[PDB]
Design a protein around this motif. Structure first.
Motif, PDB file in Angstrom:
ATOM      1  N   UNK A 183       2.777  -1.191   4.576  1.00  0.00           N
ATOM      2  CA  UNK A 183       4.216  -1.143   4.387  1.00  0.00           C
ATOM      3  C   UNK A 183       4.907  -2.195   5.241  1.00  0.00           C
TER       4      UNK A 183
ATOM      5  N   UNK B 105       7.113   7.463   3.215  1.00  0.00           N
ATOM      6  CA  UNK B 105       6.242   6.359   2.823  1.00  0.00           C
ATOM      7  C   UNK B 105       4.950   6.411   3.631  1.00  0.00           C
ATOM      8  N   UNK B 106       3.897   5.814   3.076  1.00  0.00           N
ATOM      9  CA  UNK B 106       2.649   5.658   3.810  1.00  0.00           C
ATOM     10  C   UNK B 106       2.660   4.329   4.555  1.00  0.00           C
ATOM     11  N   UNK B 107       2.299   4.372   5.835  1.00  0.00           N
ATOM     12  CA  UNK B 107       2.182   3.140   6.605  1.00  0.00           C
ATOM     13  C   UNK B 107       1.148   2.207   5.985  1.00  0.00           C
ATOM     14  N   UNK B 108       0.001   2.747   5.578  1.00  0.00           N
ATOM     15  CA  UNK B 108      -0.987   1.974   4.841  1.00  0.00           C
ATOM     16  C   UNK B 108      -1.536   2.824   3.708  1.00  0.00           C
ATOM     17  N   UNK B 109      -2.002   2.155   2.658  1.00  0.00           N
ATOM     18  CA  UNK B 109      -2.714   2.793   1.555  1.00  0.00           C
ATOM     19  C   UNK B 109      -3.974   1.986   1.293  1.00  0.00           C
ATOM     20  N   UNK B 110      -5.132   2.647   1.355  1.00  0.00           N
ATOM     21  CA  UNK B 110      -6.407   1.997   1.092  1.00  0.00           C
ATOM     22  C   UNK B 110      -6.847   2.282  -0.338  1.00  0.00           C
TER      23      UNK B 110
ATOM     24  N   UNK C 150      -3.135  -1.884   1.650  1.00  0.00           N
ATOM     25  CA  UNK C 150      -1.750  -2.319   1.539  1.00  0.00           C
ATOM     26  C   UNK C 150      -0.968  -1.754   2.720  1.00  0.00           C
TER      27      UNK C 150
ATOM     28  N   UNK D 202       3.440   5.928  -1.632  1.00  0.00           N
ATOM     29  CA  UNK D 202       2.865   4.584  -1.531  1.00  0.00           C
ATOM     30  C   UNK D 202       3.356   3.874  -0.279  1.00  0.00           C
ATOM     31  N   UNK D 203       2.663   2.783   0.039  1.00  0.00           N
ATOM     32  CA  UNK D 203       3.208   1.805   0.961  1.00  0.00           C
ATOM     33  C   UNK D 203       4.451   1.194   0.327  1.00  0.00           C
ATOM     34  N   UNK D 204       5.452   0.900   1.147  1.00  0.00           N
ATOM     35  CA  UNK D 204       6.716   0.434   0.610  1.00  0.00           C
ATOM     36  C   UNK D 204       7.317  -0.640   1.508  1.00  0.00           C
TER      37      UNK D 204
ATOM     38  N   UNK E 122       0.214   2.432  -5.398  1.00  0.00           N
ATOM     39  CA  UNK E 122      -0.253   2.193  -4.048  1.00  0.00           C
ATOM     40  C   UNK E 122       0.694   1.301  -3.259  1.00  0.00           C
TER      41      UNK E 122
END
Lengths: 132, 132, 132
Positions: free
Chosen positions: B19, C3-8, B17, C105-107, C67
């Protein structure tokens, strides 16, 4: 409410992402790109969910396989430029939580400024799941 | 159209995912927070997809691994305060369905009121998949 | 940024999709359907994330399992009809990236026209993951 607060998808299921879906022409006599060509919010809602059903059936799935729905509305004359939430619900309750289609996805619904298709009052995005 | 109506992801694939992604500064001479700092809708679209490519490459992925794209536009002067859908498409078709990058994700695109970054005309959200 | 730039998400994890979540009533003396009933953007943000926590805990999960987060804001009087991004952040940083809840999380966050609930300034959509 005719929606699920949460929907859990098993890790063994495949996800199907569906592009934003806009209504089909309802009135071929109406001027191009007008709301009259597609209907009020209720009629356009019915059209979009009919179309989503056809998209899924092409993948040997159906509306009950939808796990998440996102509904973008634009303001309607019947409701003074606010989203016509009543019309959305009147169309929506014909496809989810019914005797024929009892399952209810997670849903988000809100009003945006504009949709890329002139005359459209609703666009619907979806994620569906195919069990193992 | 340069988009896939549906994209199916196998259950064995991991999801990434991403952002909401906003354009990079294009003109360091332009006043802060102005559209001129970032470009018209086409230029900002190019910038956002360049940036998304870099984000994915940092994860050893690329734009072809995107399975779903969501594009939020704000109104532009060229199109009278409506979303500049033509400019979006002119930028978008340079990154998807091309000889270099033939894959086309599912997509939704619509006009919102405002983005958190002053001067930004587009923000893009994405989901990508990493095969087993 | 919080925030996370990406979440795997690993393919072995199950996904939980959460419907759009609106704030709880904050002031039972306030007139129905007014922003005063729910608070300014910061207070409503706190309420929505409290509620999301309760939704997840009902599934034996918590805010750290989110996520992806999508935040839809409407314009506020404090910020002249623009989204109150500062108030969102003031509420948001109390639930993510904290000592008690360190995960981010990604946002995506943006301003829309209207939410279906009168008086609401924020609606939040989420996807969470349950590990194997």
């Amino acid at each position: 409410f005719p929606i699920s607060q949460t929907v859990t998808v098993p890790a063994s299921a495949s996800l199907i992402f569906i592009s934003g879906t806009l209504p089909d022409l309802a009135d071929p006599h109406a001027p191009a790109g007008t709301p009259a060509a597609y209907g009020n919010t209720q009629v356009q809602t019915v059209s979009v969910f009919n179309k989503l059903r056809r998209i899924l059936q092409q993948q040997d799935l159906d509306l009950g396989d939808i796990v998440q729905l996102r509904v973008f509305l634009v303001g309607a004359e019947e409701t003074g430029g606010k989203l016509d939430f009543a019309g959305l619900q009147a169309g929506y309750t014909q496809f989810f939580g019914t005797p024929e289609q009892p399952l209810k996805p997670a849903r988000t619904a809100l009003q945006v400024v504009a949709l890329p298709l002139p005359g459209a009052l609703i666009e619907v995005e979806a994620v569906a799941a195919r069990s193992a």
